[PDB]
A paper describes a structure:
A common mechanism of resistance among fungal pathogens occurs due to mutations in the enzymatic target of azole drugs, the cytochrome P450 lanosterol 14α-demethylase (denoted as Erg11p or [name]). Azoles inhibit the demethylase by coordinating to the heme iron in the active site via a heterocyclic nitrogen atom of an imidazole, triazole or tetrazole ring. In the present study, new high-resolution X-ray crystal structures of the ScErg11p6 × His [name] mutant in complex with ITC, FLC, VCZ and PCZ and the Y140H mutant in complex with FLC and ITC, along with the wild type ScErg11p6 × His in complex with VCZ, provide evidence that disruption of this hydrogen bond network leads to weaker drug binding. We have created and analysed the structure and function of surrogate triazole resistance phenotypes in the yeast [name] by creating [name]/H single site mutations in lanosterol 14α-demethylase that have homologues in numerous species of pathogenic fungi. This study shows how alterations to a water-mediated hydrogen-bonding network, between the drug and target protein, can affect the affinity of the short-tailed triazole drugs FLC and VCZ but not the long-tailed triazoles ITC and PCZ.
In addition to detecting the mutated residue, a water molecule (843) not present in the wild type structure was found between an oxygen of the ITC 1,3-dioxolane group, the propionates of heme rings A and D and the aromatic side chain of the F140 at distances of 4.0, 3.1, 2.5 and 3.3 Å, respectively. Water 843 replaced the phenolic hydroxyl group of Y140 but, because it makes no polar contacts with the inhibitor, it is unlikely to have any effect on ITC binding. Each mutant crystal structure showed the long tail of the triazole ligand bound within the substrate entry channel in an extended conformation, with the piperazine ring in the chair conformation. This conformation was stabilized via a water-mediated hydrogen bond network between the tetrahedral nitrogen atom N1 of the piperazine ring and the main chain amide nitrogens of H381 and S382. The water mediating this hydrogen bond network resides in a hydrophilic pocket that contains two other waters when ITC or PCZ is bound. The binding of the long-tailed triazoles ITC and PCZ to wild type ScErg11p6 × His and the [name]/H mutants pushes Y126 to a position so it forms hydrogen bonds with the heme ring D propionate group and the amide nitrogen of F384. The susceptibilities to ITC were comparable for the strains overexpressing the ScErg11p6 × His [name], ScErg11p6 × His Y140H or wild type enzyme i.e. 0.09 μg/ml, 0.77 μg/ml and 0.105 μg/ml, respectively. The ScErg11p6 × His [name]/H mutations disrupt the water-mediated hydrogen bond network between enzyme and both FLC and VCZ. These findings help explain the FLC and VCZ resistance but retention of ITC and PCZ susceptibility in [name]/H mutants.
Numbering used by the authors: 8 to 534
Amino acid sequence: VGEALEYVNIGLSHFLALPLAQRISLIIIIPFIYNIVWQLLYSLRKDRPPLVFYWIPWVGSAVVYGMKPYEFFEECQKKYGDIFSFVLLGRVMTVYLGPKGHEFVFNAKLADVSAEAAYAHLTTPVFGKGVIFDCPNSRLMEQKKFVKGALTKEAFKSYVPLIAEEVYKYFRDSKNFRLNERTTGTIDVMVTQPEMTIFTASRSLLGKEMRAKLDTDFAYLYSDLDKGFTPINFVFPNLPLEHYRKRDHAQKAISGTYMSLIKERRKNNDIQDRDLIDSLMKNSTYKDGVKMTDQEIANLLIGVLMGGQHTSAATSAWILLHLAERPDVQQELYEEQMRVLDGGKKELTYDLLQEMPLLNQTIKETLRMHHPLHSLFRKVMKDMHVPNTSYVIPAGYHVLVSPGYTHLRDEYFPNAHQFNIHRWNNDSASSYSVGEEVDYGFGAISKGVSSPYLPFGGGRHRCIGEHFAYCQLGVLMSIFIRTLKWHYPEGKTVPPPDFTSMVTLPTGPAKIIWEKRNPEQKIGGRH
Ligand SMILES: CC[C@@H](C)n1ncn(-c2ccc(N3CCN(c4ccc(OC[C@H]5CO[C@](Cn6cncn6)(c6ccc(Cl)cc6Cl)O5)cc4)CC3)cc2)c1=O
Ligand code: HEM
């Protein structure tokens, strides 16, 4: 033994004096071997869900998960069942598939999991400090209440003509259309829909001043701010690169613009009930009496606009793309437009939108097939026992829930990969509570989150934008349908989703050909 302890020390010294051909070599093989040995040992544990095997330490299953998450989930599900873990760029993600996974993650106790700890590192640099995920959950809850206060039926009634005006202006003025000059053309929907989305959301939520800014070089700041909203920021949120500083600059410049308007509205006592800015100026005091600062108000405006931007733009792109190979659905939607709007003699209102079930069912079905967020995350803050299992998810893990995956399962939606708006006949609401409700601070929502359809998530982190999204999408698609027919270039069809971007937008270029339904129809107004 004595001799052995000596030769241990000796072996150590001979180890340190290896040629750096082998030292560099051992710098690679040692962690590689430890990783594989650690996994085999991990597999022996019965209080842990199975862990997907991976070859490269730290990286884990990043590539296959990033490129095709639903295919990844399906294969893991076949081998391991509904609960399994995988390593992702240094983190361990525990996936719980299906309605029980929805319950496990969306209805997890506040003490058990943290959304802000999963999300803040990306969003905070983009939006700014003090809001959304850069604050305690209790603060988020009331910010959602504040924002929801501008998103009432009365507001939607006033937004609908504004959104309509923006859509028509876009048809009139955008080079992508120019309907007074051209009767047919080709567009990339991932060019048109982001523009139509920011134009309509700006006009209605932010108001005319902020909409007008988008016709200036100021619009480039939004483009710059947009480039900070990228999944890689979950890993590298701050690097001394240029686009990171353009991001920081844009946030300052845009929030500064919002603050300028806010302070100006207050100076002139010009605070009314037009938009989300008026609403937050009038209603942004927390229940402990602390008021949101003008900066936090501006930051919250940025987050709300950015949130609504990507989910909605991707969704209307998908709607156009699915309908492009379905002239039968376009035809059916057009008949409904003619029926509800008296052949076009009626002006579209929010109330008439609610009487367009097939149009709303079209949005609903598109959100089924294209959940914009394929994976929602929480960081596990306290050890969690998985009910009816021996599994414990330890603090420091992340949990991953994927309702968009269940959207595409035949067991819950027959012929799930078929686009069929009629699967929602007599069920055209954006969603609803099938039972008991609870209020986390921003209104009563469904207590259960077991619905296999969950485009807007559930529990305390549930979306509050769904009715604004349907309003915006509804107005936009109503006008599209009444104005245009469209189809694919020969041999083109619905593109696959890009699962590596922030939302599951279509892989580009995603082009459709439009044609005026009334070649001679003119859009009035000056330009
Ligand atoms: C590196 C190699 C490469 C192959 N790779 N390897 C892995 N990946 C990858 C993995 C995962 C993902 N992502 C996609 C994005 N995703 C995600 C994005 C946003 C998100 O948002 C949830 C929260 C925060 O943002 C919002 C989004 N939102 C909700 N409604 C509207 N937007 C949010 C909520 C509230 C407010 Cl005010 C703003 C915002 Cl933005 O909710 C959650 C997940 C995580 C997985 C992407 C790429 C790769 O690309
Ligand atoms: C089709 C459109 C949209 C879809 C499918 C969608 C989806 C979602 C989902 C799944 C969540 C929960 C995320 C999680 O649990 O981690 C969420 C949260 C949220 N979304 Fe949306 N969203 C949409 C549009 C919007 C719009 C238009 C707005 C604002 C007007 C908005 C603002 C918010 C807010 C404030 C939250 C709460 C975040 C939290 O509490 O952590 N969303 N959304």
